[PDB]
Amino acid sequence: AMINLHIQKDNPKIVHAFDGEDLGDKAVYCRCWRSKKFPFCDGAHTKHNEETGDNVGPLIIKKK
Template sequence: YDKYRGIQQEHIMNFNIEKSKEKVYDIIDVEDLAEKTNFCRCWRSKRWPYCDGSHNLHNQLTGDNVASIIMERKPR
């Protein structure tokens, strides 16, 4: 781990979300999800843990290519 410490500090992913917590995690009841739900994977959303499209600006500014994870319910 130590050999990566400096690299990791330069590449913090989470700048703003729940920084007072030791770890950011979310518990979501699948029964509460809409038919299609977009979850943020870029850590830039202002609607965390849901995607608000902020990944588009992040990608423009950094050249990155991240986006949400989309969860869909199977039709019943």
């Protein structure tokens, strides 16, 4: 089964690259491909996990 169902389907391989210095105090990245704000997490993983029985969640890059 496909993981990504609707995001940027004209792109054969979706990669995001960011400069660490350009991130704010807390960046929350989506790993479920259900966020309406992809590549950022909007909490869509909660709905995905509840509907499917999954346990996925985001990647957080924060300031010390």
